[PDB]
A = this chain, B = another copy of it.
Amino acid sequence: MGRDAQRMNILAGRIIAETVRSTLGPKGMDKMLVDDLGDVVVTNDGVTILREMSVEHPAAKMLIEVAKTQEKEVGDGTTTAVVVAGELLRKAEELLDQNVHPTIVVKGYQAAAQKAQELLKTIACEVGAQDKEILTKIAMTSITGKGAEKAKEKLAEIIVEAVSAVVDDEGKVDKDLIKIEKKSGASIDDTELIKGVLVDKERVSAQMPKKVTDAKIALLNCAIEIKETETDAEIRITDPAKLMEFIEQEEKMLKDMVAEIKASGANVLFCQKGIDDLAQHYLAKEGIVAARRVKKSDMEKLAKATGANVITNIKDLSAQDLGDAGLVEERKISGDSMIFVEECKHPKAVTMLIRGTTEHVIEEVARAVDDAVGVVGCTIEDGRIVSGGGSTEVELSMKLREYAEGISGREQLAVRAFADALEVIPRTLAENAGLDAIEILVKVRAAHASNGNKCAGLNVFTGAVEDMCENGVVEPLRVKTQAIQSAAESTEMLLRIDDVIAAEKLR
């Protein structure tokens, strides 16, 4: 009973752990996912693989739940954590044949995790905020498995210039709002960096100007038209010449309503609903930008950038509820028509537009930008950049072997197993090649046996061995520490189960 239900839980986890094994290197194979209706999709990363997966077995759920909590942190060390956890489980499964029972292995892993975390903090350097040439290599190496055939130089010079705006001034809080729009076009690969406001909404009546200098943005909500809500106090009619007079008065009231806004100092009108065609001419004889259908996601970016308040009615508008803009234009680019408002006041956030050919290419960039800025915000606030490319694990493996010699007991085999399991990263990063096999792992192991030589690792774009800091691979340390912590926490939630029962009571 103790050994029957224990091996099944490990076998059920090793199947889902080795699924994202091939989707780890920069030049790895993708995954084709089909559905019952007939939706064939292609996924190259490993985050989407863990979501759309048959979680019918209880063992194939806790690991995914743990990985989802770690992916929402930095979003980079998700697949490697699952690979390390699977390697640890496979290494610990063989150690159960000596009849020692799972207990000392957990203590050994807990003792080795602290040593690894202490050693990782001593193999890094100090990166200040006055650098610039160092902050671009991390952005260049962040886009490898997504699509290096078009994103390797153009997408590495516009992210650093866009993020470095409020992070260098305040190195603590830099929570921005970055929105990526999924739209196609006709070009190969075009990247636009809008330094203003982007509105994704067209019109139907092209009878309004689209070039106003130093215009002012005025945010107006509802309660503007004649009928939009309801009225509890009902009214009555007496003479037929009174209703027509009231209608004419309510129609002419719009003239003075627009004149008041013009005299207050505003030339841009942003309404939540739609603007009637009869209210356009009144906005054309005075030079006021007419717009309609403003999404809340696009409207919330106007109060913190231009500087204006909202009006719940129509008679609550004065002079302090106005903003300031630069140039509002409506160009037809990439098929659809979008509104560009340039020169605001406080350039906090930024907008990035990607134009490709079909429809699956732009989406491929949608999962690449969010994973490219996340490695930047954790760089200025920290600065413990280590040597990426599978060099930290090999360096820690040579230290754990000599550190485990100072202790006596059955806990040394656990530390040795944890140290040997760290060599799975170079075996997976070199499996995608044909001229690597196993000689690369033997050559990179005896190279770090001297005094120095630490930045050397492995690159799949050459074949030989060289330094990683001189090429352009500078993976941070947080993405490794969080991955190691997740792997050490997930490997203990399965060995401490042993038996499994069932019940008919909810919760």
Contacts and interface: CB of A to CB of B under 8 A. Distances in A.
B22 A501 contact: no
Interface in A25-64: 27, 29-37, 39-42, 49, 51-54, 58, 61-62
A501 B41 CA distance: 11
A7 interface: no
B52 A505 contact: yes
A38 B493 CA distance: 18
Contact of A506 (B19, B35, B435): B35
Nearest to A494: B32
A104 interface: yes
A49 B51 CA distance: 31
Contact of A40 (B29, B62, B104): B62
A503 interface: yes
A502 interface: yes
Interface residues of A, number: 52
Contacts of A173: none
A434 B22 contact: no
A496 interface: yes
A465 interface: no
Interface string A53-80: 1100010011000000100000000000
Contacts of A104: 434
A259 to B, nearest CB: 32
Interface stretch (A95-103, A131-139, A387-395): A95-103
Dominant SS at the A interface? loop
A432 interface: yes
Nearest to A110: B149
B31 A497 contact: yes
B29 A496 contact: yes
A250 interface: no
Nearest to A107: B27
A413 B32 CA distance: 28
A128 to B, nearest CB: 28
Contact of A35 (B19, B409, B493, B504): B504
A504 B434 contact: no
A334 interface: no
Nearest to A49: B501
A7 to B, nearest CB: 15
A433 interface: yes
A149 to B, nearest CB: 8
Contacts of A433: 103
A497 B54 contact: no
B29 A502 contact: no
Contact of A503 (B53, B432, B499, B504): B53
Given A29-B496, A31-B500, A409-B435, 9 more contacts: A22-B499, A31-B497, A31-B499, A32-B497, A32-B500, A33-B500, A34-B58, A40-B61, A42-B493
26 contacts: A19-B499, A19-B501, A29-B496, A29-B499, A30-B497, A31-B499, A31-B500, A32-B58, A32-B500, A33-B500, A33-B501, A33-B503, A34-B500, A35-B503, A35-B507, A36-B504, A37-B506, A40-B58, A41-B507, A52-B505, A53-B501, A54-B504, A101-B434, A103-B432, A103-B433, A410-B434
